[PDB]
Every structure is written in C-alpha cells, then in structure tokens.
C-alpha cells in the first residue's frame, strides 16, 4: 500500500514541509494445471463371464477417487504436486498460527467461535466451513451445565445439524477428511481458486504395455482415466501481516 | 527421440486473469462518525462555557 | 491495467488511515492539535477499564458506558476492530448458555451491544493493543474541512532528486487539509469529565 | 476402492510421468430361506357347535 | 497392430499379429447308478 504523511506550511527550509514520496507494488503468482490419473486393468474372460458390466461399476468409483485425491491435496497436503507452490489449506492455517486444539474452550461451539475469530482478526470473512460427519454427534450433544440442549430446540423433535453460528457446514463424505489433522476448517471460499484444464477423459486400452505386462499378450484390457486441474490461494495481504490467512482450523484434542 | 515439453515451449499458449487480487478498501471512521464544518480561515475560534 | 485507476483508490484509503490514527490513537498527531486523541484522552481522563475486570466483556462495556453517563454525556457511538465479533458471540452465562446470541446454531448477528450500533474500523487504523472498544458522544467531536482532496499531475518537477521530465517519469501529488478538536463544556462538572470511555486490553 | 495418483508431462524418460495402476474388488454372501410352522387340530363337532 | 508380443514392438517394426483364442471344457459324463463305483465306459490297449 502507499504511505502518506502530515506536512507543515511555515517555511521553505523545514524538512517537514516536503511532501513524502510513496510507491505501490504488485507481484505475480501462477495457477498451474496438474494431472490425476489411474489405469484399471482386468482379464477379458472376467468381462466375458461376469453378469454385470464391470466398467459400469468401475467408472463411478474412479470418479469418486479423483475427487478424493484432489481434496487430500487441496485441504490436507498429502500428495500435493510440487508445482502448486501455495500450502494446502489445513497445514497453511496451522503455519499461519490460525489454530486451536479441540477441548481448549468450554465446549465445541466455543472452539468453533475461536476458529472463526482467527479468520475475522486476519480481515477475512468466514463463509465456508468443513468437517467430517462425526461432528453431528458433537453438535447434538451441546448442553448447558444443567443438562439442557443449547444447540437443538430440545431433544424430542429436532436433529438439524446443518449450521453453526448461522454458517452452513460442508460434511466431507469422500474419505478425504483426516480427523487426525483437523476437526474443522473454516474460512473465506472467495480466497481459493481452482482451475479446470481438462475434464475427465477415459480410454479403453487393449494393446498397450502397462507396468511389466502387455495387455494383448495377456488377454487383458484396461481403462485409463485422466483429469487436469489446478489450485491456488487467491488473496492479497497488502497493508496486513505476511502471516494473515483466510482460514483457521480446530486440531484434534 | 521425441518432442518434449521443453522442445514445444515456444508454441505453448498463455492466460491471464482479467483482474487484480487486492483487499477491500474503506474510509476513515473519523469522517464517517463525526460532524464537520467548512473552514475558510485555516484556524477557527470557539467560545465554551466554563463555570 | 490503468495504473492511476489502481493508485487513486489506495491513496484516498491511506489518507483516511492517517487521519484515523491521528484522531483516535494520536500516533502522528500534529503538535498544533492541542486536544488529545480520543483513546489517550479517555485514558488520561480516567474513563477507562481493563478488559477482564468484570464478569465478562458485557460487564466491562456496561461500566464503560457508565463513565460517559456519569460525566453527563450520552453514548451515541462505539468503535472497535473486527476481533470483537468472537468476544460478543462468546458471551455465556455461568451455565454456559448464551446471553448475547439467540443460541449458537442459527445466529451470528454482531452489529450491536446494549442496543448501540458498533462501528467496525476496517481501515486498519485501529490499534487493539491500545483499545478493545471506544464509546462516547459523537456530537462532542468536531472536524474542520479546510480544503478537499486536491490531486495534480506533475510532469516537470524534481521529486526526491528524481528529475521527472529528464527521466520520462510523471507523478500524482495528493493533498488534503483537515482539523480536529473536541468540542465540549465541563461547566458544573469536574475538569476531568470527558465525553468518551475506553476498554483497554487485558 | 481404486487408488489414483498424480503424473508429470515434461519428459518421456521420467518415472513420475507413468500413470499408476489399481484394482477394484468384490465379495459374495448368501440369503438363505428357513421355515416357521405350526399345526392347530380340532374336532369337527366343535367347529359345528360354536357360535 | 501396436502390441509388444514376445519382445517384438509391432507398430515400431511395422508388423501385425493375429491373436487366436478358444475356450473349451472337458469332463466325463457317465452315471454308475445301479452298478459299481469303479465302472468306467472306456478300455485301453497298452503297448507291448
């Protein structure tokens, strides 16, 4: 950001009479596409003798697996491509210090309030939150010191666990969510950018050599699946601290 | 042997975002909250009841 | 991109930041503005309480509004940074039930305390090491505008030893003339009576 | 469930360019029928005489 | 047209190959009902 100053108007000799110079500056960063792939080989006699269309069963499972591999590179850092220079959201929030351990507050809703607090204190707005389905039990269980519920409208007719502090929760179903790294991640969705370079392509392989083995010579076939995608954090910390971050995490107890 | 990505590099396309990533701007709390007057003189003098 | 179209909005923000940190916190306050800035003025007046003195922050805010009321002024404005939102959501009774929100599930409305609207200072001019909250009477502060923001394109001047025309450079010069004073009487009161109060950090 | 992975595209000799293999698998189980039965005997005069 | 067969890259060598395949089953089909278990429907002359 530019910097201004107070100036005097008494005499031409005074150094405080000189208007200060200031610059503005910018930097580049790159959103770089990287590829998720898998090959699923099978024997032609397995395809011939099955009463199901095997590829009809394999295609949805690989589509889910691509979603899981992408998620555990974006949220957690597990097999993140080295060309994606930004940290993953969870280790990035931890390195930024936007972190609190589960069970340091009075109750889970206290720890969620502190997590939302770190984002707000970094000048970002909370508008997304992520967790595993295990949190629904924790939220339904929130009670006062007399054992009356403070989250539900009493125990009989209510179980709605869609939100906390008016913020909707995304429950992650993919096996992507590592509860040993994070209980919950909260932040500003506007500050992350994905790129889609190429949608899912599938090819039937019948002659290729895969690993050690030639498919035609083995009487095998395979499906090759591939998808090209990019991730970056898209936020400026101009005028802030270099460690201001648009996300925060609750880490396990 | 083969055309590597380094051999093709000069032919590769490029892309740019349409806009700059920056924080939201805001004004002074001072000029928002407090009343103001036009000064014509560079100093204004103000009488105040004292006892 | 248009360089001046990016530079102009950032300079008018910076002018607002320089004015705020002079008026509220006193950081580079001109020596000719003889009134203290609002926060150090409230601390010097003794209209101050440390955060965590009372039961909770809503107890401390009740005492802060009380200093203004006992000085015969009216709370009309309150200022704070974005960090107060989690403090207000975090107000529980001793059974851990919420006293500020309508329960923890569906509510986050944090605009207001004791029916008084909060001004969240997002200009990055707020200093949370100096104040948690400042409250008081807005009518008892006076600004003067002497001259609105003027901007001139320079193309031939010498700036900081840079000769602009000889170097094929240009510059924008921005200038603004402003005055600040506290405009209140303490007749019948004590000489230390003051139209603002602060909560200092714990 | 299948396992996917990340691949590079720079060079024909790089091991990080090779797409991984994986498998899907299944198991079978049985639903087996079993029989609940009872016989209720009575005299035909009891059926004739009851109201 | 493209496969590697027996250390032979077909597309590189400008070759083709025809892969022939046949799936067949063989199990005896006789019932020893009413006789002995050892009853077999074949006899074989062995060489001298």
* Nearest CB partner across the interface for D2, out of A62, A81, A224: A62
d(CA C180, CA A136): 54
3-class SS of residue C141: strand
Solved using:
cryo-EM
Query: CB–CB of A217 and E1 under 8 A?
Result: no
| DSSP secondary structure letter of residue C101 | S
Residue with the two structure tokens 């000719």: C32
d(CA D22, CA D2): 6
Residue B10: both structure tokens together:
């000069």
Strands (E), chain B: 35-38
Query: Quick check: A246 and A235 in contact, CB under 8 A?
Result: yes
Among A166, A168, A135, A117, smallest CA distance to C104 is for A166
Let me know how many helices (H) and strands (E) chain C has, helices first.
4, 11
Query: Quick check: A186 and A22 in contact, CB under 8 A?
Result: no
d(CA A22, CA A1): 9
**Chains with ≥3 CB–CB distances under 8 Å to E:** A
What are φ and ψ of residue A170, in 5° steps?
-90, 110
The distance of Cα C124 from the centroid of its chain, to the nearest Å, equals 10
First to last CA, chain B: 99
| DSSP secondary structure letter of residue A87 | P
Complete edge-to-edge strand list for the sheet that includes strand C77-80: C48-50, C196-200, C133-136, C77-80, C119-120
d(CA A224, CA D19): 8
Residue to mutate among B5, B7, B9, B12, with most D CBs inside 10 A, is B5
Residue to mutate among B27, B29, B42, B51, with most C CBs inside 10 A, is B29
Residue A101: both structure tokens together:
């351990």
Query: Quick check: C137 and C74 in contact, CB under 8 A?
Result: yes
Nearest-neighbour CA in chain B from D20: distance (Å): 21
The distance of Cα C113 from the centroid of its chain, to the nearest Å, equals 17
Residue E44: both structure tokens together:
């074989």
Resolution expressed in Å: 2.2
* Nearest CB partner across the interface for C28, out of A6, A22, A164: A6
For chain E, positions 1-48, list CB contacts with chain A under 8 A: 1-6, 10, 19, 21, 23
Residue to mutate among D1, D2, D18, with most A CBs inside 10 A, is D2
Nearest-neighbour CA in chain B from C96: distance (Å): 35
Query: CB–CB of B22 and A234 under 8 A?
Result: no
Helix (H) or strand (E) holding A187, with range, is strand A184-187
d(CA C180, CA C28): 13
Q: Which residues pair with A227 in a beta bridge?
A: A36
Contacts of C163-170 spanning 24+ positions with Cβ under 8 A: none
Helix (H) or strand (E) holding A232, with range, is strand A220-233
**Residue A96 neighbours by CB under 8 Å, 6+ apart:** A122, A243, A244, A245
First to last CA, chain E: 52
Helix (H) or strand (E) holding C43, with range, is helix C38-45
Q: Which residues of A46-82 are buried (b: 16+ CB within 10 A; e: fewer)?
A: eeeeeeeebeeebeeebeebbbbbbbbbbbbbbebbe
d(CA A208, CA A214): 6
Among E27, E6, E3, smallest CA distance to E15 is for E3
């Amino acid at each position: 950001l530019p910097t201004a100053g107070w100036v005097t108007d008494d005499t031409s000799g005074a150094a405080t009479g000189t208007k200060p110079t200031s610059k503005v500056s910018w930097t580049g960063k790159n959103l770089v596409a990287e590829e998720i792939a898998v090959i699923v080989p099978v024997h032609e006699n397995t395809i011939a003798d099955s009463r199901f269309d095997i590829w009809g069963e394999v295609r949805p499972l690989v589509s889910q697996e691509f979603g899981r591999v992408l998620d555990e590179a974006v949220f957690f850092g597990v097999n993140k491509p080295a060309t994606w220079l930004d940290p993953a959201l969870v280790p990035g929030a931890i390195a930024a210090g936007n972190t609190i351990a589960d069970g340091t507050g009075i109750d889970l809703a206290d720890d969620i309030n502190e997590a939302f607090g770190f984002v707000e204190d970094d000048e970002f707005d909370v508008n997304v939150a992520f967790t595993g389905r295990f949190l629904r039990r924790r939220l339904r269980g929130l009670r006062d010191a007399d054992n009356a519920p403070i989250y539900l409208d009493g125990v009989r007719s209510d179980n709605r666990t869609a939100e906390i502090y008016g913020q909707d929760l995304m429950y992650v179903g993919n096996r992507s969510w590592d509860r040993d790294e994070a209980v919950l991640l909260a932040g500003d969705r506007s500050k992350v950018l994905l790129g889609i370079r190429e949608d899912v392509q599938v090819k039937l392989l019948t002659e290729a050599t895969i690993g050690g083995i030639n498919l035609a010579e083995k009487d095998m076939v395979a499906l090759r699946f591939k998808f090209r995608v990019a991730y970056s954090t898209a936020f400026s910390t101009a005028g802030g601290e270099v460690t201001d971050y648009p996300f925060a995490v609750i880490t396990p107890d | 042997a083969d055309i590597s990505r380094a051999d093709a590099l000069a032919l590769l396309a490029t892309q740019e975002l349409d806009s700059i990533i920056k924080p939201e701007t805001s004004g002074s709390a001072a000029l928002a909250a407090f009343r103001s007057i036009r000064m014509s003189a560079g100093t204004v003098s103000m009488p105040v009841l004292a006892a």
